[PDB]
From Swiss-Prot:
Entries under InterPro entries matching the protein: P-loop_NTPase, Small_GTP-bd, Small_GTPase, Small_GTPase_Ras-type
Phenotype upon changing residue 114 to N: In colorectal cancer samples; somatic mutation
Record membrane topology: Lipid-anchor
Effect of residue 23 to R: In NS3; impairs GTPase-activating protein stimulated GTP hydrolysis with unaffected intrinsic functions and a virtually functional effector interaction
Gene (name only): KRAS
Post-translational modification: Acetylation at Lys-101 prevents interaction with guanine nucleotide exchange factors (GEFs). Lysine-depalmitoylation by SIRT2 promotes its localization to endomembranes in endocytic pathways.
Organism: Homo sapiens (Human)
Lineage start: Eukaryota, Metazoa, Chordata, Craniata, Vertebrata
PTM-bearing positions, type N6-acetyllysine: 101
The protein's name in its UniProt record: GTPase KRas
Length: 166
């Protein structure tokens, strides 16, 4: 078949991992999705003239994924800009990914979600500082308005291509 990308969306509970994925796939915004559900989804996309099938694992909790973490090609590190703890927790998710791959050079994109919400507690400069330290892009998103959602997933695809021939 066509080119495939194995994508993994990780981050603390409630940051909008499902919302972002549902947005990419169903083109709408869900207000409540079972935070316990962990599942895979497919999306055919055309990115830079390439017809791609995205294979996306939406993680839930931490206590299928084992294989997806070992074989995942790129990762969205998602926090919510109104959840300081979720931002602080990014470190743990990145370290997890590093340890599995035994590599510092894993395709990743830092995602700051819920941009539609007033009075953020995590400023863009904090987010940019962290992404800069990791050597990865930072993209601000809203799963509610869909701003940045395509940017995040397309950018991760391009990061994967930069890392390996597809
Ligand atoms: N206002 C707003 N709410 C969001 C956004 N993304 C997710 N949510 C909401 O935050 C809550 C958690 O979303 P969810 O997708 O379940 O987070 P998950 O546990 O990481 O999958 C839901 O009520 C969503 O409706 C967003 O971009 N803006
Ligand atoms: C697992 C997701 C979760 O519990 N989260 C995400 C970040 C935090 O906001 C936390 C909450 O949802 N916390 C929370 C606190 C007070 C609430 C009051 C009411 Br009336 C309804 C929901 C609340 C959620
Ligand atoms: Mg979820």
């Amino acid at each position: 078949g066509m080119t495939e990308y194995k994508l993994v969306v990780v981050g603390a509970c409630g940051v909008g991992k499902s919302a972002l994925t549902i947005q990419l796939i169903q083109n709408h915004f869900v207000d409540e999705y079972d935070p316990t559900i962990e599942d895979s989804y497919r999306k055919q996309v055309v990115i830079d003239g390439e017809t791609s099938l995205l294979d996306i694992l939406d993680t839930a909790g931490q206590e299928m994924r084992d294989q997806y973490m070992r074989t995942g090609e790129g990762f969205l590190l998602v926090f919510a800009i109104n959840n300081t703890k979720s931002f602080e927790d990014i470190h743990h998710y990145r370290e997890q990914i590093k340890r599995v791959k035994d590599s510092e050079d894993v395709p990743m994109v830092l995602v700051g979600n819920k941009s539609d919400l007033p009075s953020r507690t995590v400023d863009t400069k904090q987010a940019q500082d962290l992404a800069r330290s990791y050597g990865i892009p930072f993209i601000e998103t809203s799963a509610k308005t869909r701003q940045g959602v395509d940017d995040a997933f397309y950018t991760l695809v391009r990061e994967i291509r930069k890392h390996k021939e597809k």
